[PDB]
Amino acid sequence: SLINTKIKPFKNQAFKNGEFIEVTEKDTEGRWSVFFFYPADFTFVCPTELGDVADHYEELQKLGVDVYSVSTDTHFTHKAFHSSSETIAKIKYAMIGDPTGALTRNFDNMREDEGLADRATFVVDPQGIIQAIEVTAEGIGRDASDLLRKIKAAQYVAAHPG
Amino acid sequence: SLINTKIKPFKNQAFKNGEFIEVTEKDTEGRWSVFFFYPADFTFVCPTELGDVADHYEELQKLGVDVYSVSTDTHFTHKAFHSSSETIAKIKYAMIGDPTGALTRNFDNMREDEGLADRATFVVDPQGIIQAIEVTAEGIGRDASDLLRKIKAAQYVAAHPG
Amino acid sequence: SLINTKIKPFKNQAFKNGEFIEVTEKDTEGRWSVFFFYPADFTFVCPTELGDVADHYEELQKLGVDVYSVSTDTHFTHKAFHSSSETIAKIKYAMIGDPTGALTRNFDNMREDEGLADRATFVVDPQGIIQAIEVTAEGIGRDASDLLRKIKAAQYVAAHPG
Amino acid sequence: SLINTKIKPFKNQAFKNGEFIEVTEKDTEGRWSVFFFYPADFTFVCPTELGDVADHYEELQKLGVDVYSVSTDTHFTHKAFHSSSETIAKIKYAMIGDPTGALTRNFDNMREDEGLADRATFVVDPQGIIQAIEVTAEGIGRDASDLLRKIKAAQYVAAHPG
Amino acid sequence: SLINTKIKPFKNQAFKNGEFIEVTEKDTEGRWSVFFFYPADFTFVCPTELGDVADHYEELQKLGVDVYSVSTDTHFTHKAFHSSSETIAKIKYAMIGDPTGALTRNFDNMREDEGLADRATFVVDPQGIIQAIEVTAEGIGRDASDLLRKIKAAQYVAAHPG
Amino acid sequence: SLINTKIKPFKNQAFKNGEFIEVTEKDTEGRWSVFFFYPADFTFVCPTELGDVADHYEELQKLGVDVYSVSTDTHFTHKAFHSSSETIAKIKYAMIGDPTGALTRNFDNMREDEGLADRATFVVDPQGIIQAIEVTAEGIGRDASDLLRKIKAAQYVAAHPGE
Amino acid sequence: SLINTKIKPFKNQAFKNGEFIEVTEKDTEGRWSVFFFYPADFTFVCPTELGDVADHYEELQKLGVDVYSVSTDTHFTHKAFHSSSETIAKIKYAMIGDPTGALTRNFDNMREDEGLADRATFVVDPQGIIQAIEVTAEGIGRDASDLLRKIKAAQYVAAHPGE
Amino acid sequence: SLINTKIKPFKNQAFKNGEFIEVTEKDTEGRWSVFFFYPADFTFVCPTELGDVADHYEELQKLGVDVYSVSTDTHFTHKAFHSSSETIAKIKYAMIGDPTGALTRNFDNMREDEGLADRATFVVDPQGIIQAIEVTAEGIGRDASDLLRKIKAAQYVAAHPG
Amino acid sequence: SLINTKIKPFKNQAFKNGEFIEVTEKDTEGRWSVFFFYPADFTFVCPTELGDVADHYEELQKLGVDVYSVSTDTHFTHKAFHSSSETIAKIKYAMIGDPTGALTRNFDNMREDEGLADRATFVVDPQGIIQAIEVTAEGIGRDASDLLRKIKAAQYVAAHPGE
Amino acid sequence: SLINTKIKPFKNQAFKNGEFIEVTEKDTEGRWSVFFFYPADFTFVCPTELGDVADHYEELQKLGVDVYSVSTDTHFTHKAFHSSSETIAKIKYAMIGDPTGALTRNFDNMREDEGLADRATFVVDPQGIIQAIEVTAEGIGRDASDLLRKIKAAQYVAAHPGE
């Protein structure tokens, strides 16, 4: 698995709070990052997973943990989605667009048959190291509370080596 | 270029008139087909390049021509789009979603560095042989008026050789 | 990721209830199997992870779920470990020894520079399709309760498609 | 396709207004250039596709656009041709001879099985970046009228971005 | 050299006495053939060489010897040339067009830099065997009388082996 | 065979008298080393081979010989075994853990289909040259005394060239 | 190592009891064989090893063990060697000549820079499986007694799986 | 063909006027050289070709033209042949022996299945550029007079470009 | 060396007593053949080697031995040489022309930088097996008598195995 | 063939006059050398060839020619062979042992399926250039007289270019 590997550089357009920004691997340096991949915007799956994460975003920011949602949709497309479903509107974190699929493949998370990302979550430490990975098949939901638990523990071991 | 080639096989999801269908190379069928590629849904140029084609779509069945718009967004993404712009609401032809980019690359029409299709239009005759090609950079619109041009008598030469 | 792939073949020896047995992919066919990897036996990191899973074993067996713990240690070491830690003594599921590291490499779960497996968990359905993956660096525990959640969830989707 | 690429270097002989010159990629110059490809000289469709372009040539310097017709015949062959058809006599732009087919293949525009160029027209801006492409099978003529189309404001977007 | 090798198959369009025909390698079977390559039609070199051959064409036909002029020009192009210079008008033999260069390269006679054939003459016997080759640089003329001399001698040895 | 070759570099974790150590080829320079391989800790075979070596360890240390027992188990596993067993508690020499098999593989001594080392012993001189190799299938024990003999000889020839 | 492997096929000439014979792998089947390699005949770096083995030879023989000495010399050289030394003269088991080095390479026991075999001993059971290997540098003698031991041990385990 | 290429390097022994000498490409530099290949010495085909060339030797020397006959025979055989046939005795030019066939293979003039040179003639200018090639099957003689014609012709063009 | 190998197939043109013949390996089957190589015809070295062979040819033909002289010249050239020379006019055996060098190259006997054969002689038995090879630099003549001796021996051993 | 080539470098052990020595290519420089290969010592397919060469040895010696016999046996085997046969006992030139077969392969003179050298003789001039080669199958003896002849002939041509 990619556990304990360094994420590789990337440059994508993303959507974060009414504006279009650019995220690259430098921006993740010095920070804790959570990459939340999902297959696609505007799908009939209830977006609860992206929103569930939104709910913990204030505590995540408080812990110095940044968040990035990712789909092979364009960033233009994330916006429409953010401003259309009330649940999706709770997102204040960056919503990265990866239409080239480059980011998704960097994390070896592509459903190569469908051109969409698998439902995977990655926890990356300040050094660019992947410290926790979770991937699930369509229908198996990710509970943001457990992600958070891993994250505090992850942060802890960096600080208390034993 | 692909002028005069037989189109290659494909299976993409698409949206047509309220709910979702499949398109394959055979659905093109013994008909004249128009593949109208465009970069992406929801961007800010309002694209009724697409809408003009829609306006002229009724007249496009004319001849037994199907019109297929194509972008690297998903079909989920195209509908959401048919519902946001009234100008886009005008579309009665198939909006094909090509998330894997395979359809786009079949027509050698991918902006590989962006993961989006280029502004290219293709005219395909009933045995699937491409009879006309037009490609432009963004900002240079395509007129359906004589996109309609001239399918022509492409018609004719094909039914009155020379 | 290995998501949605069918697991590969293996034949390994294991300690399960006081006895040495052999395990193969065939023993998993038709059942839900959970493959729980860990670095090594007799280490000083507490097997709270393994015992927690054992506590829920009564419960995994109800859903028709098999549990296989895996380390690059021998089944012999597993027999020994099962007799020294009271937390480990509780294990009623199979402890697979993968001294050749082949089973571990099957799930691409090897730390090659150490010769030990990563803290990885896999949920495999009766058709041998991996439906869930969870991997963590040491110090970042895997929550057994949450594991159970995913499995029940995995089971629904499987009996009630979308 | 070649949409948006930098043209590759070339040196071909050509005919212009009574006697023979050289064209290289640099003669394109900080100007808008039009490469008008056609199959061959002296065939029997009378081609004033070429002549229309000639008719509209005066207006084509307009903007500082050069017009270059291209076929796999030699420059010797193009002149003989300027002298046989009064309609062809109308041409004041460069008729490039491309016997080696290198110019044609630079624009990926060769009918490899015939050794003739396809009916393709290309618009190149002053730094040599292709901004527009149109290709058709024989029998489907190209209208200079809006070949002139729209060079456009290709002009504009380039001098008024977006 | 290609002396004593069998010519390889080909299919070109050619011009012979007011009409457009097709020549292939089958047509040369059972006959003596002379392939007279030249660089290009409508050049400022005096076409005396093609015409000089015309002068001996009646005797060549009388001896069962066919003739083929060849250039990378199209056959359309040979016509214009045949009906424009009084010297070129003497040709009653086929004037093959090889715009793909395939024939010329079959005889390894291409000026690869210029896309034109070298000034070479080939004598091919009824079995497809090359029996006499002559190639010269621009400006060195081929005297048809000597070609004829070689040809009778060539025909003779086939008949009188010694 | 590997006879008369220089041992290759290695870095392994090990157990030696209650503590974890690192062992590398550099740790062998200038000394006589015995690399004592065995399949695995905690198996059902009685460990007389390891123990027999321990019995002669004192005497080997006088001759300036280091002993490294080696299996593909981890050092963690050696810790456990060293406490749990009878005879192994007698072990005061280094127990090297080779989970990656590189040490074992260095000596061409891996049972690849098993992921375990063969029952093999090697005598290595101060320059890292292997002077004696002994390998046997299970049930055929290695005699520590014969090992010592060979070692004495190895040291002799080495200190008195050409006889 | 070649431990626990089946010997590869061979066809060699040999000196046996005043006579020249052919030996092949088919000739080892069903028997316990000891392949005793040595550098060369007529060295006189001590030929104690060949002679020592000769002394334990019928004890080896009616444990049902055959002994084959092997060097890269010819069988011709072996009879000659057998006729000059009272110690070598004592050898009554087969002395295989391996001029091509094929047997030696079979047991991967060749010193390539010298063109001679190493001081290696191999024990092969009736199934052609190598159960024991002993290799030493020149000067480090091989103990016949320890060989005998190993062979008996090998035979036991082989007839009594689980002790 | 080898037309217009610079000849390759060679060092061969030869018979020239009663003496054995060595010949290299350097001995040709700055001169017009004619390389006359033939199958073999002492054959029964009459060297009328060689003697005819000798008759014109007086004359080749006037134009500053060197003559080198070449066969895969040795210079030794050439000495012998020069003394047996009165027609051959006339040879005052160099008879190069190419026993290794390398010189012959340089001009790609070898009949590989026979180990002999083809009846080939080459005209090389002072800069080492081959300006004329004539090759024939046996029985088809090369005309020396015609050779001379080409050489004079070759010389003009060289002193009066186009 | 090519000693004890089967000659490879060949087809060459040749001169033999005024006529042109083809010679192939098939023409050698069942006979003893001597392939006598030399650099070239018409050179400045006196041809005693070819002539010496001719002198013994009669006698070789009684022993059932065929002689093929070989150079990379053509058969045409051999014709010439056979008439022009002294001693070569004495030649009644086949003079093979090898302009392509395949025969010469068959016997590994080509001076590649010269395009000529080395002064080499080969004795080949009825089964196409080379039994004797002799090669010398210029100035060191090959003695036909010694050739005969060798041939007699070759025939002997061949008709009376194992002495 | 290797005719007219320079010998490749070598370092071998040998038996010489009751003593063991080293011979290398540097030891042939400036002298005429005869490399006399033979299958093996102690065969007794006739050792006439080695003895015959010994008889012509000082005639060879004060033409300034050195003689080196070569077999794939060891030098050890050669002294032994030199002590048993009155005919071999007569050899006073160096007997090179080539256990590795390197010298033999240098002269491309090895019988690979047997591990022994062929009956080949080579003449090397002071510049290390092979001027003469003679190879024969077993049973076809090599004539010492003809060797001597060739050597004198070789030396002449070498000192008198053009005769």
Ligand SMILES: [K+]
């Ligand atoms: K996409």
Ligand SMILES: [K+]
């Ligand atoms: K292990």
Ligand SMILES: [K+]
């Ligand atoms: K052309």
Ligand SMILES: [K+]
């Ligand atoms: K010591």
Ligand SMILES: [K+]
């Ligand atoms: K040997």
Ligand SMILES: [K+]
């Ligand atoms: K030749």
Ligand SMILES: [K+]
């Ligand atoms: K006979």
Ligand SMILES: [K+]
């Ligand atoms: K030997």
